[PDB]
Amino acid sequence: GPVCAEASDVYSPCMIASTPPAPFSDVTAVTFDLINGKITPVGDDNWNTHIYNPPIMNVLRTAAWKSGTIHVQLNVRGAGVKRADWDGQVFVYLRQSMNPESYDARTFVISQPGSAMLNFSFDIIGPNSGFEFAESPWANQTTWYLECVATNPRQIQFEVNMRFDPNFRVAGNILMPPFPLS
Amino acid sequence: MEQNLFALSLDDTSSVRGSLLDTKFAQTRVLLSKAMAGGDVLLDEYLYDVVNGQDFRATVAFLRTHVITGKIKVTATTNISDNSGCCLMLAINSGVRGKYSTDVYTICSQDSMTWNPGCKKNFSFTFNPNPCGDSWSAEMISRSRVRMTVICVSGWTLSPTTDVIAKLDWSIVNEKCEPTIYHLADCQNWLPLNRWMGKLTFPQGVTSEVRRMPLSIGGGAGATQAFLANMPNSWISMWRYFRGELHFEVTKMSSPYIKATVTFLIAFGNLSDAFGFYESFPHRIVQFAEVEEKCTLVFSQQEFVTAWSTQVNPRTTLEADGCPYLYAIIHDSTTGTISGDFNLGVKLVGIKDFCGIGSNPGIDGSRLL
């Protein structure tokens, strides 16, 4: 409808990735590790990735054990393309593993001209009294991946925003390397 | 003789338990070079790996018992004459992500011990290797990749004649393994932070040495073009403003011979150096006996008018910074009979009656040391 619902709590940008520059035009994709804060372009495509350092990412990258709900907003930009000529599609997948044997936990398809905005959420829950340790060998725990596929790199330029639900809990410290400034 | 083997008590799933002797499972050596310095890693391995090659009464029980409800106790034995002193820190971390920082700031945070061999004969500590549960196992710490390190926070005040070997003794105790879990309630009775506020080097002399350290503890520690962060601080940075009762642990990291009276008070960045009226502010006088090396500071909510920001933009000057700072002031003069600088370590233990306000959108820049 003409009237949209108003968002409330603050989301923070965390990860961005630009499709490869022209003359690139092949269908491509990029994977976001929503917990460890990693961006992995598919194949050798020249994706201009970048990661920020908000409280949320600082928590996700240092909290050993996690439990709770995470809200994710995916923004898709957003290039100077005449609407009538738009043919870019966005396919996104939530995954618990990048191994071929694992199936998608959730699929969304976005065919909006210009730009798009997708809201969804997922739960972090593991075997340690409800806590999960993102890819630890213990109990074969794994992280969460957000796979983004772009059918037209010249029309589509991705932004991941995140928010912790009040039920989100953490414990334990991970020794991270220094975090480079944006 | 025949016997119903099935009915035998061979399904004993109880945890390790008994005397200290029959609960020891491993011992290690930490080589302290007589010439070492701050930030100098002494030991860096996996917690699990501690058991390799060990032959103690509970080594087997530790490794085979698939569930333990007790805690891991670490006893450190090391001692050096009063002529010197240093600061050793032992810390337990849940895991790593390659080429990690070894700075005391990052290394501590979770579980740790800080002591000075020039004051203590030994030192001990218990911990819950499973920070969010009531039980754990050797297999768990192996596959979860639990780490432990020993690091020289402050170098020797006076170098030892020869290298020193500190010894660690690992055992299981019957203390109930209680969890430490962080959450987003905006009102909490106790929030553990273990933040390394800083290493205060006060050189010997008759100058007025003043040190400042912000209570705007979020954002991490400024390294270079990057910064250090640990879970407790990233958690506190979730809120925009906060307040509560502060509990600090002050550690004498220099030898007993290096002395200086230190004043602690909370004020603002408007106070300049060379201001002999600091004592006007409510303050605490900290002195240490040759035996002593640890003093707890308490700053109740009556020390603060309002809450204050978890982060500020690093370009903000002291004058322009309206958030409170903890001042460490040489009340008299730093001296001794030997050379060396009075290193004093300050750690924010935690917050009592914690109030968290709003929500921090976040600042990428840290705050600088």
Residue numbers in the entry:
A (entry chain A): 1 to 157, 159 to 183
B (entry chain B): 1 to 369
Could you pull the original sentences from the published paper?
Cowpea mosaic virus (CPMV) is a plant-infecting member of the order Picornavirales, with a relatively simple, non-enveloped capsid that has been extensively studied. CPMV has an icosahedral capsid structure, which is ~30 nm in diameter and is formed from 60 copies each of a Large (L) and Small (S) coat protein. Crystallographic structures are available for three Comoviruses: CPMV, BPMV and red clover mottle virus. Together, the L and S subunits comprise three β-barrel domains (two from L, one from S) each of which contains a ‘jelly roll’ topology.
Until now there has been no individual structural analysis of CPMV-T and the RNA packaged into CPMV-M has not been visualised. Here we show high resolution cryo-EM structures of CPMV-M and CPMV-T to 3.9 Å and 4.2 Å respectively. The cryo-EM structures are of sufficient resolution to visualise the individual amino acid side chains and both structures reveal differences between the CPMV particles. The resolution of the map permits the side chains of the large amino acids to be visualised. EM density for S subunit residues 184 to 189 inclusive were not visible; these residues were removed from the model.
